Write a protein that binds this ligand. Sequence first.
Ligand SMILES: C=CCNc1nc(C[C@@H](C)C(=O)NO)c2cc(Cl)ccc2n1
Ligand SMILES: [Zn+2]
Ligand SMILES: [Zn+2]
Length: 341
Amino acid sequence: TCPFYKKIPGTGFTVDAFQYGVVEGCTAYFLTHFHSDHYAGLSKHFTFPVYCSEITGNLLKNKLHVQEQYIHPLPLDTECIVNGVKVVLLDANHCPGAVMILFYLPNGTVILHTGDFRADPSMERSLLADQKVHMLYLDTTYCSPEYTFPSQQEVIRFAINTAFEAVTLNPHALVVCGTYSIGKEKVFLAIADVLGSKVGMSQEKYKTLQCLNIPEINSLITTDMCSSLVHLLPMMQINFKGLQSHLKKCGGKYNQILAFRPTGWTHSNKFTRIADVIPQTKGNISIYGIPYSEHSSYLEMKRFVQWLKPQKIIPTVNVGTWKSRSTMEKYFREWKLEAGY
Ligand SMILES: C=CCNc1nc(C[C@@H](C)C(=O)NO)c2cc(Cl)ccc2n1
Ligand SMILES: [Zn+2]
Ligand SMILES: [Zn+2]
């Protein structure tokens, strides 16, 4: 059964609601981005209109084999009409192709659905500027003040510097980056760029990246593993055992692995600083867990909400317990009282 926060009242619209079979009276299924917790249910057998970004549609066609006649890509930052309702897609600053959706309801109500997003001040100079928003469907993944983490730029700075130093000190070192789905591509792209190398990866991951409209991507990635000194592996293989096995392959070409495990928030964030992160080490293998987030920190979320001044907030994450729902409402009221809306 499709939960309430996935329906747009007054429309035939659902958002990220593909695992509930046919939704009665849904005329258009919006997909904010291509992460499995959101497209769960979509497959080659889906027979209803799917509205999404261009990049999301490339992945639907190529990775899930959805039929083109059901894929409706929409440009960003453009007033479009879907089943008689004006809609706009806005960059969510999440993973490639991820959008927020603005709905202009016939009764004059305006709804912003953030999908998943990492709130940024640049969003305050999008089409949202001076737009009254009556309801906000808010990605509340990290809606609590202990969720602090550095900017994405700071994490990439640390990763680039760490990789460049280890490979400059040891030209026979190999850099490995773990990946689980799309997003966070800058970690391995930026490392490879500073090392003057391409990124080696499986055919399946190569295929996925070829859907992301990344400029000059053919110059950056390859399936030729052993011509590259940055390798991508499934996130589950980023452990001493999995990396020891990866070191045997490619035949005594490398004598050291430095590996990066991009996480979200972890408890050691409210304790250490990004410059102070140290790896787990076993022999010639080191594993760095780096807090690269594509979700808003608490402070980023609070700033965006206080700027937008929505009349009502519907959280879309952490809604499962009485404690989590009421804590989030308490923060929403605090923000409203502090900002005056
Ligand atoms: C804790 C942080 C986010 N939480 C989360 N993240 C993901 C994938 C990430 C990449 C995403 O941003 N997805 O939208 C999940 C994937 C599945 Cl399959 C199930 C639960 C999931 N929870
Ligand atoms: Zn996501
Ligand atoms: Zn998500």
